[PDB]
Amino acid sequence: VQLQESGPSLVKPSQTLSLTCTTSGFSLSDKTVGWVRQAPGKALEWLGSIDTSGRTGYNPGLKSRLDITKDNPKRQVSLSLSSVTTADSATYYCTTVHQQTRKGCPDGWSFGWDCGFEDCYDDCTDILSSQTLSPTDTYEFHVDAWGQGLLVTVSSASTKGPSVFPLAPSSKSTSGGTAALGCLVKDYFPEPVTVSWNSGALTSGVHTFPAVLQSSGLYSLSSVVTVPSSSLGTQTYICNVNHKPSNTKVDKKVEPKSC
Amino acid sequence: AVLNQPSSVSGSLGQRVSITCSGSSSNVGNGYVSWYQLIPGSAPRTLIYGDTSRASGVPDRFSGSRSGNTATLTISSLQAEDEADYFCASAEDSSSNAVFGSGTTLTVLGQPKAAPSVTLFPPSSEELQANKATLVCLISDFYPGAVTVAWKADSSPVKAGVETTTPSKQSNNKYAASSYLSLTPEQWKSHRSYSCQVTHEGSTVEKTVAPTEC
């Protein structure tokens, strides 16, 4: 089961955020698709879903700004969130959800059909003096599969692609047999940026740090890798920076210094 | 509209740990609580559904239970990979109206202490030719996750241009942090050296770079 969120990484305040989830491996007439988000430092928050019959349900506190539709042949579900503010900056997840409404009677109480014959009865023997209670509906919810999520930032600031600079190894970054080298990913907006090394061939000993929000309103981060000091003369090291908010990818070769 | 969870829960490796989730008769009392695990850098993962049933791949040490309007997630023996944020959830008044818990951060204690490795990079020639200068102090492989970072220009304290990230865990379960000193090319060239000094527990490590040395 695949769930792929798509849409803008940046939306201006008061505008309408529109996202799409492309699905695979199941039928939208068999599974219900829901939306969940998480704002920075906050808890998971339900948005809404559209079920196998096409019925929509929403978070009551957000219903005035939400709309969810689906296209069964195109296998896509769409979410719209109008009049956005910075409280709507969050990671938005497409999900498959279990939703069921169960109708039942309390302990001991049984339906009129169960008592031997649509209301709940206590004494099935003395049906003449038994009380007729309407059933209490129970509701079942859980998230089945989670998409990877799409980070959305609400801001009036403009998109900016990153500048990538090498953090070159020298005698001052070597620890005998190993050496640290990296890339500085400077001055981009909005988040996020991901960094790989040598097109994903180099994975051991990598750490990409979280970004700083500088006073300029732009983010910067670094990614570092520990390599054998003996390889610095012969092995090539390239950091691959991806900034989807600007449709930018940068590869930067990190050359060791002769110092 | 959230279910009440403790904000922080901690335990040592091997210890029993429980996370509670208190709601009302209109949510948790419905009797179908779910539980979710969020590890930074990973999408959320469903742990429990229907009060007690484990999702696919969830280890047996995770159990869920419910007593009235309060649900509990229990780890019988805490292991290193359980360090994460945990969220309960339940429908309310409708199967399509989900309320998540306020969230619990689980910290697993017991791993060995580790002194930080510090690398200080001077501004690259590419950045200097672009009329900018950033010194990058990278701090890695330490535990516990608290350091203090200070900068020097020559031997004098740096009082401007510094930005430092909060420590966060590497893939080897140790902590790393980064600190940046933004300068003009003039400031960089005019001093004899700059230093990043990192204090962790009872030690300080200072790394120094100089414009004349490269």
Numbering used by the authors:
A (entry chain H): 2 to 82, 82A, 82B, 82C, 83 to 115, 121 to 262
B (entry chain L): 2 to 9, 11 to 27, 27A, 27B, 28 to 95, 95A, 95B, 96 to 106, ...
Question: How is this structure described in the published paper?
Answer:
The cow antibody repertoire contains a unique subset (~10%) of antibodies possessing ultralong CDRH3s, which can reach lengths between 50 to 70 amino acids. The unique CDRH3 structure can be separated into two microdomains where the antigen-binding disulfide-bound “knob” sits on top of a long b-ribbon “stalk” and can bind to both surface and receded epitopes. Ultimately, we isolated a total of 8 and 11 cross-clade nAbs from cow-485 and cow-488, respectively, all of which had ultralong CDRH3s, suggesting only ultralong antibodies were responsible for cross-clade neutralization detected in sera. BnAbs from cow-485 were named Bess, while bnAbs from cow-488 were named ElsE and assigned numbers based on their order of discovery.
The ElsE Fabs all have CDRH3s with 54 amino acids and 4 cysteines, with a 1–3, 2–4 connectivity, Bess7 has a 61-amino acid CDRH3 with 8 cysteines (1–6, 2–5, 3–7, 4–8 connectivity), while the 55-amino acid CDRH3 knob region for Bess 4 (6 Cys, 1–3, 2–5, 4–6 connectivity) has no ordered electron density in the crystal structure. Ultralong bovine CDRH3 knob regions fold with 3 short β-strands connected by 2 loops (Loop1, Loop2) of varying lengths that can adopt a multitude of different secondary structures, including loops, helices and β-turns. The ElsE series of Fabs all have highly similar knob structures as expected from their high sequence similarity. Flexibility in the stalk is evident in a comparison of the ElsE family of structures that have similar CDRH3 knob sequences and structures, but very different orientations of knob domains with respect to the body of the Fab. The ability of the knobs to twist and rotate with respect to the body of the Fab likely enhances the ability of bovine Fabs to access recessed epitopes. There is no convincing electron density to indicate tyrosine sulfation modifications in any of the antibody CDRH3 regions; however, BLI experiments indicate that Bess7, with 3 tyrosines in CDRH3, contains one or more sulfated tyrosines. Low sulfate occupancy or flexibility in the CDRH3 knob region may explain the lack of electron density for these groups. The ElsE lineage was the most potent and broad overall.
